[PDB]
Design an enzyme around this catalytic site. Structure first.
Site, PDB file in Angstrom:
ATOM      1  N   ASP A  24       4.764  -0.095   2.519  1.00  0.00           N
ATOM      2  CA  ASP A  24       4.049  -1.348   2.694  1.00  0.00           C
ATOM      3  C   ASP A  24       3.808  -1.576   4.193  1.00  0.00           C
ATOM      4  O   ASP A  24       4.590  -1.089   5.029  1.00  0.00           O
ATOM      5  CB  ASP A  24       4.888  -2.488   2.137  1.00  0.00           C
ATOM      6  CG  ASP A  24       4.186  -3.830   2.352  1.00  0.00           C
ATOM      7  OD1 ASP A  24       2.869  -4.002   1.954  1.00  0.00           O
ATOM      8  OD2 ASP A  24       4.915  -4.870   2.920  1.00  0.00           O
ATOM      9  N   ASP A  69       2.552  -5.100   5.837  1.00  0.00           N
ATOM     10  CA  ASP A  69       2.862  -6.450   6.293  1.00  0.00           C
ATOM     11  C   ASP A  69       4.295  -6.865   5.968  1.00  0.00           C
ATOM     12  O   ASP A  69       4.732  -6.883   4.817  1.00  0.00           O
ATOM     13  CB  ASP A  69       1.848  -7.435   5.706  1.00  0.00           C
ATOM     14  CG  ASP A  69       0.437  -7.224   6.276  1.00  0.00           C
ATOM     15  OD1 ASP A  69       0.294  -7.213   7.527  1.00  0.00           O
ATOM     16  OD2 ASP A  69      -0.515  -7.003   5.481  1.00  0.00           O
TER      17      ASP A  69
HETATM   18 MG   LIG Z   1       4.517  -6.775   2.800  1.00  0.00          MG
END
Ligand SMILES: [Mg+2]
Length: 364
Positions: free
Chosen positions: A21, A23
């Site tokens: 991932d 963010d």
């Molecule tokens: Mg995230």
């Protein structure tokens, strides 16, 4: 076909697959223009910790609304990616747009060596609310590990390693979370909502407001590097990798290479040791009218071996309480032999893969 051959190739390379991932996992992003001002001022109290921040401009939506994104890379990221790529073929999977994902990849992976084109985004993942292993590995998920700050988007998949959300830009959340959990809105409605949120963050300057309040009161500096999550995470991923290939060596040899190991079995076995023997009762943590056992916090806890109960019929080991003035707390205290702790005991224990001393999380 490609999928079955990728599995074979990875085993010959002695690697697994890692879904990464962006963010609040390996970066934190903001569009608060305050960052640009602080970065341009060597005399600013925040300058030193911003020195490694990088930025880019994106034109977004029908109206070509343009924003300067400021990206903080989580400490140790370059080293982490280099070392972990030796053990894991890396993919990006973000809820940000393809344009956003590509801009971030240009900075963390300029020559394409780490991720190549293995970059999934809101534009091409197939969902704005959930992520799925099957978008990448539809038929065989036995070699794929995920690192993500959110467990809800993965439905608390057993291949998930939930990380502590990276919050460097204090008070700024996840600027790409606007559409999580929800239905699909019309594109016109999506763009209006995003432009609105971005414009609001630019105009409100939350970083400036917070920094000004601190100065009006090192403790007066808003931004700090105090994150060591990637050092921890490296050890976990190295462990999963080594356990997988030892089990793989054993299973495949005993089965004439017709059976194989599965990280989806390995990871839950590691996690379940942490809160093994804990029986948790929540007080004032899950909203009134929300189902407790299917709540994110319950699922997170149960993935680390905790049982969750709903009353005192079988006395819990722990009362996880948010407010002190409740009959659950009174009952727990009057009963004795039940530890009454803040929510933080649980979230910090789960975060560190380590049961922390309850004495450090009493209510008062
Ligand atoms: Mg995230």
């Amino acid at each position: 076909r490609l999928e079955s051959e990728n599995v074979k190739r990875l085993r010959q390379e002695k690697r697994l697959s890692l879904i990464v991932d962006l963010d609040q996992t390996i970066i934190h992003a903001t569009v608060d223009p305050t960052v640009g001002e602080w970065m341009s001022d060597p005399g600013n109290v925040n300058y030193d910790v911003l020195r490694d921040v990088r930025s880019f401009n994106l034109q977004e939506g029908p109206s070509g609304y343009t924003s300067c994104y400021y990206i903080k890379f989580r400490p140790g990221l370059a080293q982490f990616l280099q070392k972990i790529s030796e053990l894991y073929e890396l993919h990006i999977y973000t809820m940000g747009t393809k344009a956003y994902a590509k801009e971030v990849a240009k900075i963390i992976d300029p020559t394409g060596k780490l991720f190549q084109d293995r970059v999934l985004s809101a534009d091409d993942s197939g969902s704005l609310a959930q992520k799925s292993l099957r978008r990448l590995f539809p038929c065989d998920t036995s070699m794929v590990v995920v690192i993500d700050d959110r467990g809800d988007v993965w439905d608390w998949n057993p291949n998930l390693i939930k990380v502590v959300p990276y919050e460097f830009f204090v008070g700024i959340g996840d600027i790409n979370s606007n559409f999580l959990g929800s239905n699909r809105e019309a594109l016109e409605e999506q763009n209006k909502e995003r432009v609105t949120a971005l414009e609001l963050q630019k105009s409100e300057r939350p970083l400036a407001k917070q920094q000004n309040a601190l100065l009006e009161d090192p403790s007066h500096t808003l931004l700090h590097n105090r994150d060591h999550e990637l050092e921890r995470l490296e050890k976990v991923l190295k462990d999963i990798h080594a356990v997988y290939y030892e089990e793989e060596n054993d299973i495949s040899s005993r089965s004439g290479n017709h059976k194989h190991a599965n990280v989806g079995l390995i990871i839950p076995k590691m996690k379940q040791k942490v809160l093994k023997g804990c029986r948790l009762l929540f007080s004032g943590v899950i909203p009134l009218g929300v189902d407790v056992l299917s709540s994110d916090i319950a699922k997170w806890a149960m993935s680390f071996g905790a049982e969750v109960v709903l009353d005192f019929s079988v006395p819990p080991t722990h009362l996880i309480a948010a407010k002190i003035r409740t009959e659950k707390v009174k009952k727990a205290v009057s009963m004795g032999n039940i530890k009454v702790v803040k929510l933080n005991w649980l979230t910090e224990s789960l975060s560190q893969w380590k049961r922390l001393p309850e004495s450090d999380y009493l209510l008062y």
